[PDB]
Each structure stands twice: as structure tokens, then as C-alpha cells.
Design an enzyme around this catalytic site. Structure first.
Site, PDB file in Angstrom:
ATOM      1  N   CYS A 268       0.837  -1.148  -0.032  1.00 25.01           N
ATOM      2  CA  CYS A 268      -0.165   0.005  -0.055  1.00 25.01           C
ATOM      3  C   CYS A 268       0.714   1.254  -0.137  1.00 25.01           C
ATOM      4  O   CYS A 268       0.041   2.233  -0.363  1.00 25.01           O
ATOM      5  CB  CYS A 268      -0.919   0.007   1.408  1.00 25.01           C
ATOM      6  SG  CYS A 268      -2.203  -0.725   0.896  1.00 25.01           S
TER       7      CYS A 268
ATOM      8  N   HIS B  14     -10.057   1.104  -2.153  1.00 21.98           N
ATOM      9  CA  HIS B  14      -8.310   0.753  -2.056  1.00 21.98           C
ATOM     10  C   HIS B  14      -7.832   0.118  -2.972  1.00 21.98           C
ATOM     11  O   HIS B  14      -7.297  -1.099  -2.540  1.00 21.98           O
ATOM     12  CB  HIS B  14      -8.475   0.365  -0.794  1.00 21.98           C
ATOM     13  CG  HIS B  14      -7.020   0.008  -0.091  1.00 21.98           C
ATOM     14  ND1 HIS B  14      -6.550  -0.542   0.892  1.00 21.98           N
ATOM     15  CD2 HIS B  14      -5.737   0.820  -0.559  1.00 21.98           C
ATOM     16  CE1 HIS B  14      -5.732  -0.507   1.154  1.00 21.98           C
ATOM     17  NE2 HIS B  14      -4.931   0.196   0.337  1.00 21.98           N
TER      18      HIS B  14
ATOM     19  N   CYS C 238      -0.514   2.874   6.050  1.00 25.37           N
ATOM     20  CA  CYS C 238      -0.029   1.636   6.430  1.00 25.37           C
ATOM     21  C   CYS C 238       0.256   0.825   5.414  1.00 25.37           C
ATOM     22  O   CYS C 238      -0.100   0.912   4.314  1.00 25.37           O
ATOM     23  CB  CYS C 238      -0.846   0.908   7.465  1.00 25.37           C
ATOM     24  SG  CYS C 238      -2.440   0.622   6.898  1.00 25.37           S
TER      25      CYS C 238
ATOM     26  N   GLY D 156       1.295  -3.380   4.606  1.00 27.22           N
ATOM     27  CA  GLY D 156       1.446  -4.822   5.086  1.00 27.22           C
ATOM     28  C   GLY D 156       2.867  -5.306   5.211  1.00 27.22           C
ATOM     29  O   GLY D 156       3.688  -5.008   4.484  1.00 27.22           O
TER      30      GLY D 156
END
Lengths: 392, 392, 392, 392
Positions: free
Chosen positions: A87, A348, A378, A380
Site C-alpha cells: 500500500c 483501496h 500503513c 503490510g
């Protein structure tokens, strides 16, 4: 060297299996690269480099970012590179463009991300060796490459539960947050606030001319607390995280054009904003949802700003549980965060979201004449990225 | 400020289906990250960022660079990013490291690449929607994502034939070039020239200890022109490229540790070299093999060096046809190029090659007390990257 | 021995991907086996054997006929066998039942067939050896096991073009026949003529109790020549066979209860009909559609009947092209054939169709008190089957 | 009228992945259909029908028996049908042939079975609808369709452990039986006892003419008790069943020619034997291994023979555990059973075994001048078949 952003464009965000499902990620990337450059007033041949985030690349072909650049009409002389920081990818692209400009390696960079989560395939590991006996596994690349923690071997949604537990973020609080995001995106849509930033994608038809897709179709109209409190937990039957208080799986692209303040001046261009600072950070993968805290603190330290100095922020809403925990830890004015809705409502597309929120941030800063802004996500695996911008 | 390389390490390169075939790419990256940092004397917690190239990532899991960093012993606070510029990845990683340090974004960066071509899987495009009637295709990700030109829809080996036609590189010159590469790698193996560079990879066995893999097993000892001149062309029946005068499909990793000269001084480390300059370039996809020419020219122009100034060079040998056209166009002294052999003999793990040839270059420079060095490679999709180094 | 048919039942025929698509074939078989027995007043324990046709069995589990028998409530002491004679399978089952009774091998047999074409999976040939490089094929089991000629390697619809060319069956003649079939099935549905023969299948719903599926949902209401003339050729771009003048891909099951005349008399059961004769035949695979000509002639010769002695026939409509060619060669009275519509309208679940048309023939013979009837079907690979029935 | 067997042929049995791995089941069937006809002196033209058992047919193409008949040189006018009664299939085929002949439906029938377990592929259930999100399973068709109980969802292996418990068949009794089967097979091999019955299969070579495969390659020569008594249970860790005391996964085919005694006299042919009787039976799926008990009892009752009248028997050895339980319950002379070994040694190509043991029985009866014989096997799903033969 001061780095400026001269243009910003995004596609509307597609629903999973929705209007953008059949449009390969580099084609979505090409739309925004071409439009960003037209809005900047920069000719494709003046571009030094294209950097595009894309996380899901199985069977996509050699270097998706090059494919996007070529489809956008940029000549072969303009090199390109694809990056993957989950992301964070689309925002990290802008940071790399800035690093490059500051170092003198490039003058004018198109930076963003592109993602088609609908089109991601299944993979057959070990397909070269064969399967001598018994059942075998066709693995969802969207899940394994996009949404599965490597170190703990569970879904991102479980990290969100870990965060909700650690930081005391109740189901009720998460639902209230999610209804707020839907409600803000709905009001923003109805007020016309995404009109300028969205660039149409032409969807080919069985008969007749292609049709423009130009609306954030994932946004729920008239969302209410009741429509959410009835849902069951998606990742753990004793959990708090549902489909309604987590973002979606989506398709889209976003891009900005970055250059030195001197280059913009030379070209007669008026920047949208100046890049004030940026940072990355790492956290435990179990609580990856907290990455924006150390990244935003570092970006703010490098800018010499406090959280109170900020006029507007776009903090990506992967899960209401982490978004709330971030706001709790940061202590900033949550009325200035995601003022036109976040990913819960908008969607997203993972490699594109970093740049999508920056594009939204920039357009709202100009509309309300805010001066200091921050975008953060954030990541992953336990990271965060953040980037600060200032308008004169 | 200037950027120095303090250490360098690589795995031996494996053959396709060979000694590394079962070690996933981020595990190979972990080996060389860990060894580069040990050799440099740099503690894991002092690293600012890890940048690894990896081209084939189908089902590899979230962010292969992070995976490599964590497997290497780097704490969760150290962020990481995976990049894909095809064969250029490994060397572009070092360039991004340099831009980051010069921009003040990072202090100490581990940069390189990792690839396991043997373990690249098949994928099932369209699995998400289903196959309503009719047969469906499993596609080989190694070919599609690694070796197939998007724009022209053929193998990298046809671009090599295009370059042989355009520059008049004959079958006999390609074979002579290939034999030279083998014989040089042979001499270097016999003389222990790779002993310092190479970090062993421990390969688990059915029973007994693990076996250390530490020799470049693709290298063919005793190679002669008569062993090559009868082969049939691999890609076009009227062509010039064979499996003997092109590199192979290979597995491996490489990494360097990069920091400011100031940071090196503070830590009491003596650099291997200073990064002098670097550059990318784009060319027509059809003749991608020629990318090193305008990249090396730009890198040299930025260093204020002529091709005659160089003491040693590593130019990746994807195909003898392209390596020869490069030398023809650059005019430089070919007895200073790939002195320990090149990819034709050693192999070509695509995301790692860029950093592998840098590792080989630095280690030989020290042995010959060479002062000015250059590494460059060609890139599928029509690009090059080049990086120059200087020793005091 | 005289062999009699004491009861007969079928499901409604589901559309491809329609109401039955999620009911595996042995569950469809269990519905008709259970109901046939109940209509006969034969307890499960009295059954000697179950013979069920099923063509597409990939991943269906051990012995689909036994799975049907057990799900229908028959005790484990009742053995069962599955057979495959492509479209002939469900009629061939009855023939084998008759042979068994005549031989003294069995007393009471439930015979028919079952098929779920919607659920047939893809297969991966050579999955134990692995795919060393390049594309690999997932094959459609429905096409390869059900619809593809082995010897000529083309679709069954090509065999239908072959027949149309050999016998001079025009597109317009096929389309006129297709209209006839739709219009007869429509009339028959509105008149309640399928009411007695169809047994409901309960289909689970996301909300509420199961809903009975009990109507032939593939039937096109209000068909005219104009609704056929808009389809394009389905298998040969230059040909005459379309989706509209061919049968569909469908799901369903059918079964009858067979026993000796003495056994029925002993049990106090009045039979529906006596089996007069049956026969198989073989023809060239290229023209498999003509199979019913030599099978029907042989069954008629063994019955000592002429084609003009028949009061009613069911000749399966795989393709209008072949059904017309069969009528042309037999010279029988087409007004007496498929009087309630044929597979073009009702659909064609391959392993069940042979018993489906038999069940339809029996109920119509009963309704109008016709005395002599014949059912016949063509069979992929170049065969036919036929079976004659006589009512008192 | 009585029914006679005029000829009998089999292939040698291939080991899993061994000599027959690349030869599709219908090509194996063709070998034995052709040879059995040449042995009988019967012209292909005169055959009324072909019935072949084949259990694993995923992707095999339309009607594998028809494929066998056509590859054997039989004309298109000869019809064929494939059957599936799991391990029962190849003997049940003979039973159906006998039923046909007695009923006057056929005059001459080629009956048996064919199986290639090696080449059984993986299937992708649900492939037609797609996998919206999540991993998908490739199922092994050999396991699901051949070796897994539907009702209890576990391996045939567990049914054998059930049998061993119920009847007190210990691990030591199982291993002794297994070593006995191996040793008898070896002795028969050495004595030339399979030479007449076996027909070579020509295995094509990478260079040169094909090489004949003509021996039972699964048989372990020099087998001893110590080679079995340390093996771990294959299915249940507190169980008795191992890989040494169960049959294997194997490839092969077998066929006999069946006609009326009258037809044989008319053609001037000497039969091998007369079919005396046959029967099927069903038992609980949990103890399917016991099937031969009620089936052999019924066949004996139909013959008016006692178990002590029998001169020779072939009882399929799927698992030592069930074979020993069968002998215990039948009370017969085990010295007359599987005199040349059984499937533990020779192997178990599921669809072909039933006819394979019959071919073995008949050849041994002629050499001993035995008068009364019986073949019987157990069937997954809870069934047994048995067939008795008599010689003058």
C-alpha cells in the site's frame, strides 16, 4: 533543492468486479500519466522518468510502469520503473521522484500507482515439478501478494484485530468511523468535490462508442450505523473487523508530475504545492496498521511542524481499527482528516492508493486554501509512509 | 557529499533446476544482505533502508525485499522496497540508494537484487471470473514477466537478432565472444578469483549435513569454438543466436552496502569505492540490447570521463550479439571488459544481475588497483542503466 | 420373458448455469430413483440393481450410480453400476436392465441416467509430470468427454454440418424444425402435459425455505422463425447449425422401474408398457447424427413392426440438422414424433436424455392411449440406440 | 443356451509411473481386444459389441471403450460402451456380455477393462464459475474417483483396517499373506506361467524401433518377511495396513471374447470354458472388502456348487486384510486360490483387474486341467462380483 508538484490526477475508483475490472492496470496507469502531463502543460518528451507502484504483477508482462508510460504516449527514450512497497507504493513513488530530483538524477518525474485487483490471477506453485500425488493448491495472488502477512501467515484483517485489541478500539467506534467515511464521501460527491481530480476512463462496449467511467462507484449512499452493526466479523468470529469497517478490494490509478521549483519556473508553470518532507518507518508486522504513526512523526520532525500545524490530512483507511488507533496516537484534529471520505467509502486499489490520497489532498487544500498538509498509509509487513506538502 | 560502497557480496549463480532451485528468492537475498553488512562491519539496526530488485514475484508473498531483510536479521524498524526494472533492477537499486543518500533521505542503504528463475510458477489468467466454456491457458510467469517483449510480442532473443542484423554482428563473432567468456570464467575459477566475493548458500540434503553451494555451476570449462559452431539457432531458424552464445535462466542474489563518505568516516570504515556517476536511458524495445550505449555515455558524461579513461568494465552479456554491438558502439578496450567472464558463462538471474556484475567489478578493481570502473546492462522493454565507480 | 416398465419419472431440465447447476448429478439421480420406486409401489429393499448413465464424471467420486442409489434411500445391499454410451447412456441403461431380467440375473431394476453439465470441471493433463516451460492447457471436461469427436477432433456440431451437407438440410429447414419444437413444448407446458412425469427438485435459497424446481426452464416461449434467423452459426462460421437449432447444454435426470411381467403381476402392479425390442448400431463418427436410422430399423425389424405401425415416437433432437435427416431417411409420420417438443426446446443433459425421452414417451402414450412407440438417440462417436414399447 | 469364453488376453501390469505410464487406457484396451479376437479366430466384423470397464476417465475423450474398439481395428459398425463398477468393472463387463447373449441381444461380445492410473489427471472443481476470492483446490482424480469412500470420506485403506478389526486379521497375518503372494508370483514368472496370457505392448523409444513390455514389473522378486515387518502403517498409525500388504496403483488392460456355445460350434471354435454362473452383492461401504463373500456365495448357489467343489479360484487382493477375511468366511482351500500370486504382487489397475484375474484363472485351469473355477473381487462403495466357469 525544492521539489514541486505541478499536477495531480486520478481515475474514479472501481468496485471489485466493477466498471474497471477488464481494464489492465497499465492502461489505468496510462490514463492518469497522460492526463497529469496535460494538466501540468508538460510534453511527454520532456519527461525524465516514470515511477509507478503496482503490487499485483503476476502475468502482467515485463515492467508494468514502462507499459503504462508507452500506452500514455511517452516516447521510448523516457525510462520507467515499477515499485512495490504494498500500500505504500504509490506514495513511495513520489518520494523516489523527489529523491531523484534533489540528487540531480532527474528533472521531471511522473510518479504514482496503478492497480487492478479484479484482474489478479491464481498461481500454481511448483508447477514445474509436477504433483506426484494428492490434492494441490491454486493460490489467490491477490491474497498472497497483497493481503497476507508473510511472517505470521494470516490476513491483514488479523493485524487489524491485533491493533483493535492493543489500542482498545471497539466495534462500535469502528462502525461509527466507517459511517462517517461513507457520509463524508457521499457529501463530497454530491457537492462536486471529486469532479476536478477525476479523469475519465473509456470503457469499450459490445456495440457503439466506449462509455466514460468517472464516478467513485464504491461509495455507499445513505449509509447508517444500523446497516453496519448487524454484520458479522470477517476474520475472527470473536473479532471486531467486518466488510463494512474495512476498505474494499478495488481498481484504479493515480499520478502526479514532480519537478524542481527551478524547472517549474523555467517552464512558466504554477505549482500546486511544494514537497515539504517525507519519511518511511517500520513496525512489527503484527501491528502494521500503526505504521503511519512513526512515519508521520518523522515526516513532521523533518518538516519542523507539529501535528497541530497541519491544516488537512489524508490518512488511508485500510481498516477503521487502525485508522482510529493512528488518530489516537497522533492526537491531531480528526475533523481535518479525510474530509471528503476515505478508503472505506472510496475504495483501496492497493498500489495506487498512496498517490490517490495525495491527489485528493492536493485538490481539497486548494479548494479551502489550506497551507500545510500530510498524506500517510500503513503497509503490510509492518511499515508506514508519509509525505508533507505546503502551499504558498 | 558523495556516496561510497563499503562492501559487496554475491551468491554463486545456480543453473536452471540446479543447486538453488528450491531456495526462494528472498532467502537468497537474505544471504547477501547479511554477508554485505558483516563484511562492512555495519550492525543491522544502523541500516536505513533495504532496496532489492526482483522481477518474478508471482506468489512470492508481500514485498520480497522486506522478506529478504527480515530473513537477513534486520529488525522490524528497517523498512524495505522491491523494485522491478527487469534486468536493470539490481543496479537501479544501487542508484536509488545513491539518490536517497544524496537527498538526505537515508544514511545507510543495502541495495541489490535477488531472483529464482527455476521456481517461477504458472498462473491462470481469468481464474477469478471462471471459464464458462472452453479450454483455459496456464501461462509461464518466467517467460511473460521475465523474457517476453510486451510491445512486439516476442522473446528477448529476437531483440538480440534485431541487434545482430542492425550492427552486423555475425554468428562466428558471437561464438568467439562466448568462448572467450567461458574461458575467462574458467581461468578465474581455477585462480580463486571469485573466492572473496562469493557467500556460500547451505543446501539442505535428504540426509547428512547441508552442502555449501559456492561455485558458479553454469560455467563450462574447456569450452571451444567447435563446441559452439554447429548448434542450431534458438529463436529464429535463419538467425545467429544459440543457447551457447546467450546466457541462461539462472538463480542468485547480490548486494552492496552504500552510505555517505561522511558516515563511513564516522564509523571508521574504508570504502571499496566511491560512486562517481550513474544514468539510465531508453531505446526502442526492438533493440533493447543497445541500452548500455546511451546509458554509459550519459554516466561517463556525468563523471567527466571518456571511455578511454576506464580501467575495468562489467557489461552484462545477456546475448553475445548485444554485448558485441555495445563494444562496437562504445569503442572501448575490450580486454578491460568482463575480465573474469560474463553472464554467458556465469549466468543471468534477471533481478540480481545488475548488482552481481557490480560485485564482480569492485572485487577485481581492488586486485588490479584499477581506479575508474563502469558497470552497465541492457533491459527488456528498451532501457539501459550504467554506474561508474572510482577508487583513490 | 416379457419385460415391463412399471413407473417412470424425471426432473425438469435445468438451463446451463440454471436452477440445477449446484445439485450434483447423483443427487438429481436420487430424486428420480426415489420417486420412480414410490410411483411403482416398490420398496427400496426389493430392488435388485441400479444402472445409471452419467457421462461427465471427473471428480464426481466413486461410482456415481451407487451414490444416487444411496442418496435415494436404497440399502447398501442393492448394488449399482454407472455406464457411459454418451447420449445413449440413459436408454442403454434400460436395455441392460432388460437383458438382466431376461437372463435371470435380476428381478427389479431401476434404470436411467443423470447429468449436471453446468458443474463439469476443467482438467489438467500431465499434472504429475509438471510443465517444464511455456503454456499449459486446462481442458474443459464437458467438451472433451461429452461433445468432441475423438477420431476427427472437432465438435459434435461439425458432425451435424456434415449431415446437413450430405442430406441437403438447409438453415431455413433447421430453423423451421426448431420453431416446431419450441411451439410444441410451449403448448404442452400450458396444457399440463408434463405435470404427471416431472418430479420436483428442492433448491435452497439464501433466504427462506427451499423452492421446488419443476418446469422445463430452457423452453423459449413464443418462438417464431424470426427468433431463429438472428442467430449466427455456432461451430462452423460458414455453416447452418446455431445455438437456436441445436439442443442446449443442460442438467437433469430420469429413471424407470423395470421388471418381468410375472413379477409385476405377482406384486399387483399394472405396467405402463412392455418393452417390445431394442437395438444398437454403429455409423461413421463423421455423421454420428444418423445413428438412429440403423438403430431404429433394427429395433423395428426385431419387433416385426414397420415405421408406419408406430403411434408415437421420441427421437432426440441433438441438432435439427440430424433430426431432419433421420426423419427424411425413415419416412415415418413426423406429426407423431416429439409431439410435446424435443431437446431443442426442453434441453439435453447428455447422460440422462435417453431415459428423459423414454419417460416423456411413456406419459404421452398413456395420455392419448397410443399403443406402439419408439425412442431413439444418436451417439457421439458414431452410434445409435432405439427401444420399442407396446401398451395393452 | 449357455455362454462360453473363447479367448482371453491381458497386458502385463505396469508399475505406477513405469512402462505403461504414457500409453492411454484405450490404447491398452485396444491391444487386448485385438489379441483376444486373433486368439479366438473371430473376425472383427462379426463382433456384436464391445464392453470395457474404465474407472478414471477425466479428459479421456468420448466413450473410452469405443476408442479401444476403433484402435483395435474394429469397424465403425461395431458399437461399444464403457462401464464403471470401480474394481468390479472388468468382471462386470463379462457379466453384462453373458446377460446380452442369453437375452439374444448380442451374439459375440468382447468384454474386459482398461486402466492407466499413472496418467490420471488433476481436476479443478468449480472452474466454470470461477474463484471470486480465495485459494482453489486441484483434486487428484485417481484418489477421488478411484480410492476414496464417498459415504465415509476416507481412503479404501481405512475400509481395510475396519475389516481387519472386525475379523481379527493381524499385521503379522497380513505380512505373511503378502510375502506368500510375492513368492508365488515370482515362482510363476520364473516357470513361464504368464507367457501365454500376456500380450506385448510396444513402448515407443526416443530412437530406434519400439521395445516390448511383456512382464509384470510390480512383482518383487526375493521378497521376505523382514522386508515387510518394519514398515509403518500407511493409513492409521495404530493400524495394520502398509504399502507392502496392499496392492499398488497400476496400469494395464484385459479382455475376453464371449459368445453362445452354439455360435462357437457354428464357427468351429473350441471354447476355453463355459460361464457357469455369476452374481453381484452389496455390503456396507465401511467393510467393502467383504463384498466377495456374499457375491461368491450367491454365484456358488446359482451354480449349485459348494466352496469345496472349486478346483481353482482367483480372489482379488486389494488388501491382505480383506483377502484374508474373505478366506476365513468362505472356508475354502486357500492352496487353490491365487496359485500364481495376486494383486499385492502383480498390481491392481482398477478397471481392468476384474478381467485380469479371469484371464489368469482361465490359463491356469487349462494347464492343471481344472474343471471348476471362480473369480471374485471387492468393490469400493461396498460391493462384490463373482463369476464361475466350468471346463469339460
Amino acid at each position: 533543492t525544492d521539489v514541486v508538484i505541478v499536477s495531480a490526477a486520478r481515475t474514479a475508483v472501481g468496485k471489485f468486479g466493477g466498471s474497471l475490472a477488464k481494464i489492465p492496470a497499465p492502461e489505468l496507469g496510462a490514463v492518469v500519466i497522460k492526463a497529469a502531463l496535460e494538466r501540468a502543460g508538460v510534453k511527454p518528451e520532456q519527461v525524465s522518468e516514470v515511477i509507478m507502484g503496482q503490487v499485483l504483477t503476476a502475468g502482467s508482462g515485463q515492467n508494468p510502469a514502462r507499459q503504462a508510460a508507452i500506452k500514455a504516449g511517452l516516447p521510448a527514450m523516457v525510462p520507467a520503473m515499477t515499485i512495490n512497497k504494498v500500500c505504500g507504493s504509490g506514495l513511495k513513488a513520489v518520494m523516489l521522484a523527489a529523491n531523484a530530483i534533489m540528487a540531480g538524477d532527474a528533472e521531471i518525474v511522473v510518479a504514482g500507482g496503478q492497480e487492478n485487483m479484479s484482474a489478479a490471477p491464481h498461481v500454481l506453485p511448483g508447477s514445474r515439478d509436477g504433483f506426484r500425488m494428492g490434492d494441490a493448491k491454486l493460490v489467490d495472488t491477490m491474497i498472497v501478494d497483497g493481503l497476507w502477512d508473510v511472517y505470521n501467515q494470516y490476513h491483514m484483517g488479523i493485524t487489524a484485530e491485533n491493533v483493535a485489541k492493543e489500542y482498545g478500539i471497539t466495534r462500535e467506534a469502528q462502525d461509527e468511523f466507517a459511517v462517517g467515511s461513507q457520509n463524508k464521501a457521499e457529501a463530497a460527491q454530491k457537492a462536486g468535490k471529486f469532479d476536478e481530480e477525476i479523469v475519465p476512463v473509456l470503457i469499450p462496449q459490445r456495440k457503439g462508442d466506449p462509455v466514460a467511467f468517472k464516478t467513485d462507484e464504491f461509495v455507499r449512499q445513505g449509509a447508517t450505523l444500523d446497516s453496519m452493526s448487524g454484520l458479522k466479523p470477517a476474520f475472527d468470529k470473536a473479532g471486531t473487523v467486518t466488510a463494512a469497517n474495512a476498505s474494499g478490494l478495488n481498481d484504479g490509478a493515480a499520478a502526479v508530475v514532480v519537478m524542481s521549483a527551478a524547472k517549474a519556473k523555467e517552464l512558466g508553470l504554477t505549482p500546486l504545492a511544494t514537497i515539504k518532507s517525507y519519511a518511511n518507518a517500520g513496525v512489527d508486522p503484527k501491528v502494521m496498521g500503526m505504521g503511519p504513526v512513526p512515519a508521520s512523526k518523522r515526516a513532521l520532525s523533518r518538516a519542523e511542524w507539529t501535528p497541530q500545524d497541519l491544516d488537512l490530512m489524508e490518512i488511508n483507511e485500510a481498516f477503521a481499527a487502525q485508522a482510529l488507533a493512528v488518530h489516537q496516537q497522533m492526537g491531531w484534529d480528526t475533523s481535518k482528516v479525510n474530509v471528503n471520505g476515505g478508503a472505506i467509502a472510496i475504495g483501496h486499489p492497493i498500489g495506487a492508493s498512496g498517490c490517490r490520497i495525495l491527489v485528493t489532498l492536493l485538490h481539497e487544500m486548494k479548494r479551502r486554501d489550506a497551507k500545510k498538509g500530510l498524506a500517510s498509509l500503513c503497509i503490510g509487513g509492518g511499515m508506514g509512509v508519509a509525505l508533507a506538502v505546503e502551499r504558498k
